[PDB]
Paper text:
The ATP-binding cassette (ABC) transporter [name], also known as Multidrug resistance protein (MDR)1 or P-glycoprotein (p-gp) is a ubiquitously expressed drug exporter that plays a key role in cellular drug handling. [name] is a type II ABC exporter/type IV ABC transporter with each transmembrane domain (TMD) comprising 6 transmembrane helices (TMs) and followed by a cytosolic nucleotide-binding domain (NBD). It is topologically arranged as a pseudo-symmetric domain-swapped dimer with the 4th and 5th TMs of each TMD making extensive contacts with the opposing TMDs and NBDs as first revealed by the structure of its bacterial homolog Sav1866. Here we present cryo-EM structures of lipid-embedded human [name] in conformationally distinct apo-, substrate-bound, inhibitor-bound, and nucleotide-trapped states at 3.4–3.9 Å resolution, in the absence of stabilizing antibodies or mutations.
The predominant conformation of apo-[name] observed here features an asymmetric TMD arrangement with a closed central TMD pathway, closely spaced NBDs, and widely spaced extracellular “wings”. We chose to classify this state as an IFCLOSED state based on TMD conformation. The structure is marked by multiple secondary structure (SS) breaks in the TMDs mediated by Glycine and Proline residues and several predicted SS breakers, most noticeably at G317 and G329 that leads to an elongation of extracellular loop (ECL)3 and wide separation between TM5 and TM6. Closing of the central TMD pathway is facilitated by TM4, which adopts a kinked conformation with secondary structure breaks at P223 and K242, effectively dividing it into three sub-helices (TM4a-c). In conjunction with TM6 and TM12, it forms a central 3TM bundle that closes off the central cavity. In contrast to TM4, TM10 adopts a straight conformation, contributing further to structural asymmetry and leading to a lateral opening to the lower bilayer leaflet. These features lead to an overall conformation that diverges widely from canonical IF open conformations as demonstrated by a comparison to the alphafold-predicted structure of [name]. The IFCLOSED state that is dominant from our analysis is incompatible with substrate binding, with TM4 involved in 3TM bundle formation to close the TMD pathway and also sterically occluding the substrate-binding site. As such, TM4 may play an autoinhibitory role and act as an affinity filter akin to the regulatory domains of ABCC-type transporters. First, the IFCLOSED apo state lays the foundation for the development of a new class of [name] inhibitors that could potentially trap it, thereby preventing substrate access to the TMD.
Numbering used by the authors: 33 to 81, 106 to 606, 694 to 1230
Amino acid sequence: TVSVFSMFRYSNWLDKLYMVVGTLAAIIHGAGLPLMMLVFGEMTDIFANNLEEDMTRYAYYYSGIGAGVLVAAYIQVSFWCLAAGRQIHKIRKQFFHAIMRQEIGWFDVHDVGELNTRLTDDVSKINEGIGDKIGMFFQSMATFFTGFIVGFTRGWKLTLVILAISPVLGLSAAVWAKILSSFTDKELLAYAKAGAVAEEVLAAIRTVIAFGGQKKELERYNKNLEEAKRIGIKKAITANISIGAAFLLIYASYALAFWYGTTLVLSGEYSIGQVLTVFFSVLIGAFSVGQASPSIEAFANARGAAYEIFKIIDNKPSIDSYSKSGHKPDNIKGNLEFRNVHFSYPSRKEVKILKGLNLKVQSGQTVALVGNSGCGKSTTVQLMQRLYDPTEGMVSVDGQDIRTINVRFLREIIGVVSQEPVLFATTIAENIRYGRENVTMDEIEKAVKEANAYDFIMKLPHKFDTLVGERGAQLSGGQKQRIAIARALVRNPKILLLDEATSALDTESEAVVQVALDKARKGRTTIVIAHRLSTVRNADVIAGFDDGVIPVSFWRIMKLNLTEWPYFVVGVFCAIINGGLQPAFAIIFSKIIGVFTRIDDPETKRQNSNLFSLLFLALGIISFITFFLQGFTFGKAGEILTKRLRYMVFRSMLRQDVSWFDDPKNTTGALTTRLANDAAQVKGAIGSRLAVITQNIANLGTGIIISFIYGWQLTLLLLAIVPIIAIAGVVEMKMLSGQALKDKKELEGSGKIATEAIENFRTVVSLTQEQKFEHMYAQSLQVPYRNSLRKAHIFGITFSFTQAMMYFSYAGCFRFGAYLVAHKLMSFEDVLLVFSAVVFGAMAVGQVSSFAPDYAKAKISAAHIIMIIEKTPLIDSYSTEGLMPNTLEGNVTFGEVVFNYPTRPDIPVLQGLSLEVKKGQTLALVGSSGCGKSTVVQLLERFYDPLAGKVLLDGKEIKRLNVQWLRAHLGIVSQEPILFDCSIAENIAYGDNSRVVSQEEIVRAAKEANIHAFIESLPNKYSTKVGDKGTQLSGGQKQRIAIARALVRQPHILLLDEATSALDTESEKVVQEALDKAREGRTCIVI
């Protein structure tokens, strides 16, 4: 994604030398096995015909090659794994440095879970990418050319004979298909559109559920998925037909070459040993290409992850603390001011929070600005600390603007006591000493004495010993606030900004906290923000602030993808014949070898000439047909399965309750990933496991049977030796997984420190304690750094020993085989046949098992998919039962209603009020006890379920009525509307999905919403799109569109959720009068 020479950005001279020596050793190692074939052939030629002198000369040659490759095998892996270990340590340490530098305005746009997951996984992905794989790649190439070179030095004809008949071509086509699959994609765009629709619906799940438009969204998703299925089928057809056409062209060219010259073109005189060289070397070189595909896949994934890693690293923030270039004034008596400053959030530019606020505080003063819990409370607190730069105007301290002061020095003289006193999982002494790192115990003691908290600490055991406040005994709000006050006192600031110190903690402990605040407030400027106006009277200046105004894996997966049984039958038959064809190639070669290696026989006989071309054409046609049929059928079956599964899982997700979405385990990102990743790349693996198993069985069993027919002793010897190399590969993968799984345990302290810093990032930047967290992460990396550098020796030794065993296996086979052919028994053609069957079927199945994605994540993904279906039908949106009365009096009564949020049931939200509504009467909950305004909209719409209490609609309990009918007779308007990416006409007709409404109803609703003129003034009357790529609209236009959408339904009860959110105080009159005009003769409840 970025480049090919940019992933190696962090590499000094030593790492460059490591990589160069590693790749040179790999090149030497790769060109060793084909060269051994050459000397083996020389030795056999000499033997077939002083004997000890020739035998011992090549024996030292044979031992000399073996010794060098044994050393080269160690150097190839040892030096590459050291270079990757040194770069990843620098990348991992540098990436976390960049994260701690980005300001607050960037974190809210991104996701903390996404950032932690990326830091945990894509760095490991890069490590796997630039690790030992690259070296392996060169080895394969170092073999490949070498083998062919040998095959083309000792007679080019024979290679051309072996290149066609032998099993080379099918495996080559399989690996070309693997690479093309790894490089094309082209599904991504289609499912990108479909998943854009999916995430648009999922993010707006509240309004979709409240409006009952599940079927319409399901149909839109179905249409997009059908388009994706069509394009995927076309792509699979094109790819498979192209590869098959290449196969057919190769074999037809062979057949034509055999014409126009009756076999004299491809025949010559060859020795008994030369054929062994030009056969085994060519076969090994052609088979080596199968080992270079995982390397290419790994490198591509490494580039993909490194793109995002380097984008985050390279970005330069507008304001950064890691820049010691700024004014550092002394004697800051404190003269903060606001020179009529307008501020708007960078994310929501249209919404304005600070509408030109002016403030002026002298030294040794205090302010008591009073805010509202809904919003407009902590914006000035954030703006003062240079978290967000002002849009218009400026903020100055002591007559000096803060834009010319280094932010690191600026943030170290400001108190930041906030609503929730977040603490870290460490000792209380460390928590108090986080600010002002050069602090002795005496200062901490003095602060806790002037914090009204040491008495409580001493009454409890463990005097500042551990008292962890994250996983241990969770302290009460009062003592946590006292701890935060102590930390602020240790910081020793000059501008104290106590914010929401009386937000949610109980009134029982108000005395101690308030006394501590009053004691600590003396001697410094104070901009206290409070909601209750009964204890901030001690401040010099009091003003009001408001809107700028002052499981287990399961089988039975085959039940899914069952209706498409003819595709499976045809694919299985084609897999059987394709797998069985490859061993038959050995028989064909053993039968026709005698015709391509003799010129003494007159060309008049020419054998037959024509039937050889017929055989080549027949083999080409059969291979083409079988490969095309297998690929097309299995691809089509997999795509149909994934489309149907996506449809069903999306329907199941839509059906279930909103509380399932409210669970923090599954957010919109998790569900999008489930619909995207774990429904298409996994179930295809289970569907094609039948194909791969059938192909492997047909490849191996047929070869074993034909070898047994053509031999007994050598066949049994090879059937005994192949399990040895299989066990060697098992040991290799076991050693790889021994550290691939121990790495997670090793990298656990670093991960927890990183996630603690990232999750609480606002407190970290406020305290300017990023350097300490960076150092802790540095140590938690340093220990696993030594562990990873020690892993290199073990990995190198294991790889070297496995390679030595694989190298010694070939020598033993030739020693025994020559022991059989010399004493008659088996002809050399039979030896070639049995080798090509047994060992080159074992290698072939070993390579094919690497493809066809693993049956490990597919099972857990299938379990997740199955568990998502029929998961929580407790409150089904389209329940069939229930009564639907015709009359609707519109009376809502509440009695002793007690409800708790399922995510946090310990904290109550409903006190058990008694609220009764008559027809044609309006009321608001702002004047109630508070904190219970944004909940009644869930209760009346049956989003949740009251644990204790009762709700009556027109004197009837709402639990018995059908949910769909209840949702179809309620109008809801929120503070802001979310508009789907479609035309305005559909966004207006969305109000009533029971039946299709024509243009007349939409026009009348727009007229009643005072929005018709604006819509008609647009270049497109009703076909204009909205959202991201559409025509952007202001707050008033969106509010009017929402009012029109609500009024299309013609409901009987209206639910307003802070509609008058003070959107610039310019278009409020028109929307207010439209709402008042639409509120006549209808029950309403304003929040």
